[PDB]
Amino acid sequence: ALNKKAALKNSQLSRKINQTTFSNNKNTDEQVTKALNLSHFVGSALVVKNDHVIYNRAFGYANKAKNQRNKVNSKYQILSIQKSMTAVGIMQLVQAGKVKLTDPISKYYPTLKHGRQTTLRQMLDMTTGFRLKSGSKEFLPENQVIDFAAHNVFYYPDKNGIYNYSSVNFLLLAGIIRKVTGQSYQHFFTTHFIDKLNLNETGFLIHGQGQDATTGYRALADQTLPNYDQTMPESKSQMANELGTGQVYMSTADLFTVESAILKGQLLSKKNVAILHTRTATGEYGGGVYNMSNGIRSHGLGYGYESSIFLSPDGKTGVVLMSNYYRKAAGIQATANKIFTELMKGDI
């Protein structure tokens, strides 16, 4: 219907994006702003080159009703980009000698009837046959979010060992962090990421964003322009059910800091970062990110938000775009991809 039309409009936007020039004898602000304006971007945009911020600008409204404009320090949902952080949490446990990537899931989830042999390595690479079709419709504490998933997950033998995206893999990994450490995931995340890296605009949505908050907006089918006519709800249960997988908010700077710190070896040895970030035979995905010849990427979608990061192998050069106004017909990822490609060539 309009669904199909929206995919087509987005293809056409990617076309116009991909055919924009980009020269380094022209002002960075002007060129990036032109590309963001093409997609009618709403949110905040960060471009870093050899660790220097070269573009940092916000567009549209954090909360239109309250006349609050998005700011460079606005907070957005990182969504699935949190999986890369859960992945690093697991590999920290590997480095500390507390788990192995060859461990079978049945070591941690003894009640599972099928897929018991599935390794932690496979869960980290999206090469498992597990799927959770939906979480609990009522708010559950972490231990019960984990219990729900372990008892409600499907297993598909056809999908064992081949890349197929399934979020429950990372919820279950978060439950393994809980079991091994005896800590909550929220506490683990706070000490290992928030405290460690001095993140001041990072937290869990279930506890509120505080200052510089944003509101998620709902687009009607096939719309490209932001009208802010409808907010997108997210219940407490939906936030709880994103344990390990998409329950965190960050500023663009805080997201860049985490992903960069990972690659620079600040949280985990460079050797273990490389072991973690290893693609598979069937997919670029490995260890919670997509692995490319020219760095990593991760993308998130939900609750009216979209998030995107592209980052160079050494962590010093990249693009973060986050939006509180997802539109299928005006996605942000192709824009971030093009900026990153140009940035890595030397064209900015």
Numbering used by the authors: 49 to 396
What does the paper say about this structure?
We show that lipoteichoic acids (LTAs) but not wall teichoic acids are D-alanylated in Lactiplantibacillus plantarumNC8 cell envelope and demonstrate that DltE is a D-Ala carboxyesterase removing D-Ala from LTA. (a) The dltE gene encodes for a 397 residues protein composed of a transmembrane segment predicted between residues 12 and 34 and a larger C-terminal extracellular region from residues 34–397 and named DltEextra. The domain consists of two subdomains, an α-β sandwich (residues 76–126 and 246–397) that form a five strand (β1–β5) antiparallel β-sheet flanked by 5 α-helices (α2, α9–α12) and an α-helix-rich region (residues 127–245) folding in 6 α-helices (α3-α8). DltE is structurally homologous to the D-Ala-D-Ala carboxypeptidase R61 (DDCP) from Streptomyces that exhibits the classical β-lactamase fold of PBPs.
Besides the apo form structure, we obtained two other DltE structures in complex with tartrate or TCEP (Tris(2-carboxyethyl)phosphine hydrochloride), two compounds arising from the crystallization conditions. Intriguingly, these two molecules are anchored by an interaction network that involves eight different residues, among which are the conserved active site nucleophile Ser128 and the base Tyr213 (Ser 62 and Tyr 159 in DDCP). This suggests that the tartrate and TCEP molecule may mimic the nature and position of the natural substrate of DltE in its active site and that the acylation/deacylation step of the catalytic reaction is probably preserved in DltE. Three additional interactions specific to DltE are observed in the TCEP-bond structure and involved Tyr211, Arg345, and Gln381. Notably, a Tyr residue (Tyr338 in DltE) interacting with TCEP or tartrate replaces the conserved arginine (Arg285 in DDCP) in carboxypeptidases. This arginine is key for the recognition of the terminal carboxylate of the peptide substrate and the carboxypeptidase activity. Instead, residues specific to DltE (Tyr338, His347, Arg345, and Leu349) stabilize the TCEP or tartrate molecules. Taken collectively, our structural data suggest that DltE would not be able to recognize the D-Ala-D-Ala terminal end of a stem peptide as DDCP does and that DltE would not be a DD-carboxypeptidase.
